[PDB]
Design a protein around this ligand. Sequence first.
Ligand SMILES: C[C@@H]1CN(c2ncc(Cl)c(Nc3ccc4c(c3)n(CCC(C)(C)O)c(=O)n4C)n2)C[C@H](C)C1(F)F
Ligand SMILES: C[C@@H]1CN(c2ncc(Cl)c(Nc3ccc4c(c3)n(CCC(C)(C)O)c(=O)n4C)n2)C[C@H](C)C1(F)F
Lengths: 131, 131
Amino acid sequence: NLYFQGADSCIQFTRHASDVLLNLNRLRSRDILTDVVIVVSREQFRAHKTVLMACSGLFYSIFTDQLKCNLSVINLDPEINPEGFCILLDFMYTSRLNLREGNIMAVMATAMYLQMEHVVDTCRKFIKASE
Amino acid sequence: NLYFQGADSCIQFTRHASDVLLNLNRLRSRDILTDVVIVVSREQFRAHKTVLMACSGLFYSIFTDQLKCNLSVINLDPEINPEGFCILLDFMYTSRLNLREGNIMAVMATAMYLQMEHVVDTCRKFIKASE
Ligand SMILES: C[C@@H]1CN(c2ncc(Cl)c(Nc3ccc4c(c3)n(CCC(C)(C)O)c(=O)n4C)n2)C[C@H](C)C1(F)F
Ligand SMILES: C[C@@H]1CN(c2ncc(Cl)c(Nc3ccc4c(c3)n(CCC(C)(C)O)c(=O)n4C)n2)C[C@H](C)C1(F)F
């Protein structure tokens, strides 16, 4: 079944949120209604400001600032690893985090900078397992 | 736990999609980065085009049209019931559909017009239960 009786009066749809996220990622792949470019070193990543704000404390602060909310280009710290950013951007649109031994440190440092608490805590737990 | 091993290599976060949707609804309540007004009769509803496109076949068609994608105001058919639209807009941002005996017909007619198949099918199943 696609739905159930929630704790409240409303009928709740089980796959709705993941279906919305899937469709937002489809818009991203097709470059539909993307309204910002995130520049990390040489690399450029097109995205939707609302998705970035929904996932990152840093992007929330940037796009709620009256001066910066209108910027079409956002440059991150040039010390940010582009692959780490790419993995986190993918995560934002999919719920899947491609953590590997070779990228975990860059992913963690990027999540810290982006203020993505859950990802930071997760990276920390995986690092602790290896020691 | 916040995460699990998905069918693929990636670590998947269980609540990520619903957390993104919750944050998108918070942006809507605060009128943050809303980029469209949907006019239904007298009523006005501010929203995010990408959320509308992710949930509705009609909004997908409107905002992928080269001429209409830039419109800041969208007028729906004046025969659309504002309460039915409100319930569906709430559903888009929350996954909860407030269906009641008094609104089910308007909600169904609105979902048909908006091309929200899952909601139409659901309304049809609930109507069938009463007969
Ligand atoms: C009043 C306002 C409500 N908040 C909020 N609203 C909307 C968004 Cl887009 C949003 N996005 C957002 C902001 C910060 C985040 C954030 C999202 N995430 C990601 C959380 C999820 C569950 C998406 O992984 C995260 O780790 N941090 C630190 N947050 C939290 C903020 C602190 C607030 F209190 F100021
Ligand atoms: C190539 C492109 C991919 N599609 C798609 N991509 C992105 C979005 Cl925003 C999106 N949104 C969208 C469009 C139509 C919808 C639609 C969303 N929904 C809602 C589906 C969910 C699961 C969100 O309830 C629905 O019932 N209908 C009919 N769909 C389906 C369309 C038909 C397509 F094939 F042309």
